[PDB]
Specification:
Structural class: mainly beta
Protein name: Green to red photoconvertible GFP-like protein EosFP
Organism: Lobophyllia hemprichii (Lobed brain coral)
Keywords: Chromophore, Luminescence, Photoprotein
Strand content: over 45%
Distance between the termini: 27 Å
Helix content: under 10%
Number of strands: 12
Strand order of the largest sheet: 1-2-3-12-11-8-9-10-4-5-6
Largest sheet: 11 strands, mixed, barrel
Radius of gyration: 17 Å
Family: Belongs to the GFP family.
InterPro entries: GFP, GFP-related, Green_fluorescent_prot
Number of helices: 0
Length: about 220
């Protein structure tokens, strides 16, 4: 197969961080078998955003991961019907986010319906003060917990002033079709970068590379 070597990506995100409402559109392309995707984002409502764009970026699809023969590829096996994921982001100073994405496919295009909710960021903290620089590359640990494919990673935002701001991610992943078989435990190495932006991060180009491995 359903998945082509070059696929298009359409996205809308709605959400709310610390009471601030926003709507963000994405248009992108990627190479599912190479583990590569990029996306052009445009803030449609609520700009300029009063918080660090970086908290959002991992919400803007593990289909775009290079999987070896010897690990079951749950994501590419979910198409054409698709899959959903739910994520919690627990930051070290008490900020919490819940994000979800329902992913479908029509022809050569993935469609993404994303919701992003955050609360409890301190007003003087690096998120609300816009002090973040980038996510460090990391490794997602994939396993099965009570029948549900689960990915954990301890993430780190580099801040100005050479300190890191830590976040624990937990994602659950669910195929829409009954009986897509679950994989065994494995790892996914990943890196996400902002390639370019304008002044207030109303237009942003994003890139991710991800590779599955067994350790």
């Amino acid at each position: 197969s359903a998945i082509k070597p070059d696929m298009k990506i359409k996205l809308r995100m709605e959400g709310n961080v610390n009471g601030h409402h926003f709507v963000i559109d994405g248009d992108g392309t990627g190479k599912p078998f190479e583990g590569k995707q990029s996306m052009d984002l445009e803030v449609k409502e609520g700009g300029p955003l009063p918080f660090a764009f970086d908290i959002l970026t991992t919400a803007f699809n593990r289909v775009f991961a290079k999987y070896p023969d010897n690990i079951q590829d749950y994501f590419k096996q979910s198409f054409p019907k698709g899959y959903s994921w739910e994520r919690s982001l627990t930051f070290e100073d008490g900020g919490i986010c819940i994000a979800r994405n329902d992913i479908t496919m029509e022809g050569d295009t993935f469609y993404n319906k994303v919701r992003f909710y955050g609360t409890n960021f301190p007003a003087n903290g690096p998120v609300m003060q816009k002090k973040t620089l980038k996510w460090e590359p990391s490794t997602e640990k994939m396993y099965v917990r009570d029948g549900v494919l689960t990915g954990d990673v301890e993430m780190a935002l580099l801040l100005e002033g050479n300190a890191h701001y830590r976040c624990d991610f937990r994602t659950t992943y669910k195929a829409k079709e009954k009986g897509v078989k679950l994989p065994g435990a494995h790892f996914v190495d990943h890196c996400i970068e902002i390639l370019s932006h304008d002044k207030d991060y109303n237009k942003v180009k994003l890139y991710e590379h991800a590779v599955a491995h067994s350790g």
